[PDB]
Write a protein that binds this ligand. Structure first.
Ligand SMILES: [Sr+2]
Ligand SMILES: [Sr+2]
Ligand SMILES: [Sr+2]
Ligand SMILES: [Sr+2]
Lengths: 298, 149, 149, 298
């Protein structure tokens, strides 16, 4: 029903800490602006209008930060904890949640205030300002799709059935339509339907010393970018993050984390921006993905 | 009788989508300025005035955008839809309609606001600013004339 | 957690109709006074104080009655229904509910207002006044007790 | 969709001039109070509350009266016309109309203002106050109800049918149910379902010198009130109005109007307030009724 605001230390991460700015002790209220500003570069000659390029500018969000402590002691620990947790991580993910959507925004701390105007049991009413890194991005799970064989029908499919030594008739429209492929279980598509910017991936390699990772194909089946690593031993899994702020390329074997960046194919990794088409898995047994697409206004 | 404000995605186009900002769920109210500004380049020599060329400058129109949803869910879907539709097309055609005229102005999204100051059933009252591409033009059918004996 | 206000037509009765003035379409907000006034009859002779009898006086409760309808049609049916239901029964039971208590108060309709200051989709913001018959009474179940050997 | 306010000089009368205070040149805006006040007579003994009788009091309605003339001459011409039309009739009828209801009020002019603060073309913005006579009453057309014969069914109805000499069977539940009544066209009920206060009936009498007029039956088929007149000649129609303020009891014959007050039965006419039951026509060929019924809050 009502709106939910959550503050994450490091999202897409095991060491995540979540703060309920809607329900918890530290609450965010009255956001300054959740919209957008755009500068379209429209210059007009003799009444006729010429339009340039629109550079969508995102404005700082200022929240009325309130604390709900029981004692002056509690209210002071509440501010010290919340503000330092935001400082410990270089950037904080603000989740906007409603009946229709669940968007996220990466914010850096711009300004926080601390004053001595306390109400009852030392409660704070302050203003917290944030700088926009990226406004509104959907964090969704990206899974492969499977292809299934169509059922066999007499007269409709290619079979030599009924009376010996079999028959199949050429009809007009109904004629003969192939049933399905022998072992259709080999076809798997990882469909990229809309343009994506950054992603979290867990790749399970098959063979050691063979380039392991992912490649990206466009609508015409041409490779544009590929994150591939040539390791010495079989990594249990490779943890790859395409996010610009905290790029991660680490191979995992047991409890040991290895920096896979120098082993990577620098030539094949041409771009981070994934286009419409499909993703192919190179030398992988299994793969788990978390896709994050941007949305200007939500 | 009264004034009508339509918002077209692509006027003259097969993929046109029309928003009634005078009757529909998403409404435009109190336009900032519908007039014009002009810079005449008047230079004066010894008290005598000489006039150059008038550059008619068009100013940004700011509307008091209101949403008429039945639930918090409706009002959010109206903001998530109306604003993105204006963003999907590089420019949007605003139609001014009255008893005497039906002019059109090509707008580009300059600024839109979203705040948590809601009324009843999550009602929205925000300010939407547009940049002027071309102010007031008549979109009309052009046909040949026949000559009779 | 939060406070619940309910309006009953006839409580302790089969023909009861309940209105959620906290959650429903017709809502009660900002009660004027939920406390009490007392006149103790204290007259003082030469600095010494003599106290009579305290006649605890109960004051009228005035609520900011708001409607949450989807259309002008709905908002008008909402007021016509709620006010006539209060009129049909000679007195209405107002239930005060919280984490700690569930009290009830018998009220007669003192004053209700209807004005043409409608917001969005014809929503009402009016003041409803009630006269106190009996303020705060606990409605509990009275059962016998058994004796064991 | 939107609300319609209308002012009537003489509702229920031929000389009814209607002023559209929602659409017309003279407009009513911002009604002060359309609600109600009540005095419940609550006396309290030892903390326990005893409730008396509720006197529902109606408050004055004050409208922001605006004029929409084209010249100073037209605006002065509206103020003079609108206010004198209200003064010509002892009381004026308001019409509160919406998508769901159409209620009426009987107002009396309490206060009207005339000032020299003219807007554009001699525009007027003045406050008009009204005193409440009757607040919210429905004005509806009351008609009799007709009774129709039920259809004849084999085995279900009382008939001697099929194989000779006719047979009707006693069954359990289905048995024999009578079809209808011979000459069921004689049965006509003028139904009264809710308590009514005043009415404007046009009575068409049959026989001269025989008491002609309506009588009212309660739920047990007894008489409480009756408006009955004994005329010397056949009146073409008797016009009866039960309105307290302007009671009319006139017998029209041709173009001549006759006062029927002294000819009326004073003992039979016990009350004006009509109760739940039915109306009976005494010595009447035809009847046309308009029933007005009160509603405290609408
Ligand atoms: Sr991260
Ligand atoms: Sr176009
Ligand atoms: Sr009772
Ligand atoms: Sr009359």
């Amino acid at each position: 029903g009502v709106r939910q605001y959550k503050i994450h230390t490091n999202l897409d991460g095991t060491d995540d800490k979540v703060w309920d700015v809607t329900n918890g002790k530290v609450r965010f209220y009255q956001p300054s602006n959740l919209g957008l500003q755009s500068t379209n570069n429209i210059w007009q000659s003799n009444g006729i209008g010429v339009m340039g390029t629109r550079s969508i500018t995102q404005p700082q969000i200022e929240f009325k930060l309130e604390t709900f402590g029981e004692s002056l002691e509690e209210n002071y620990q509440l501010m010290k904890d919340f503000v330092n947790d935001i400082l410990s991580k270089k950037f904080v993910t603000l989740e906007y949640q409603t009946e229709i959507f669940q968007v996220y925004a990466d914010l850096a701390l711009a300004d926080v205030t601390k004053t001595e105007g306390y109400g009852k049991n030392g409660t704070f009413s302050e203003k917290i300002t944030f700088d926009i890194i990226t406004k509104w991005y959907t964090y969704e799970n990206l899974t492969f799709d499977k292809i299934q064989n169509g059922k066999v029908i007499a007269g409709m499919s290619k079979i030599y059935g009924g009376t010996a030594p079999g028959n199949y008739k050429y009809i007009k429209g109904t004629s003969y339509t192939y049933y399905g492929e022998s072992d259709i279980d080999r076809l798997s598509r990882w469909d990229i339907k809309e343009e994506i910017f950054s992603f979290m991936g867990i790749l399970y390699p098959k063979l050691p010393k063979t380039p392991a990772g992912v490649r990206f194909l466009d609508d015409i089946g041409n490779e544009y970018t590929a994150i591939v690593f040539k390791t010495e031993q079989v990594q249990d899994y490779i943890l790859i993050n395409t996010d610009v702020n905290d790029e991660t390329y680490q191979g995992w074997k047991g409890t040991t984390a290895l920096n896979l960046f120098p082993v990577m194919d620098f030539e094949r990794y041409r771009t981070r921006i994934i286009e419409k088409g499909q993703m192919e898995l190179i030398n992988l047994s299994k793969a788990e993905f978390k896709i994050k697409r941007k949305a200007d206004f939500v």
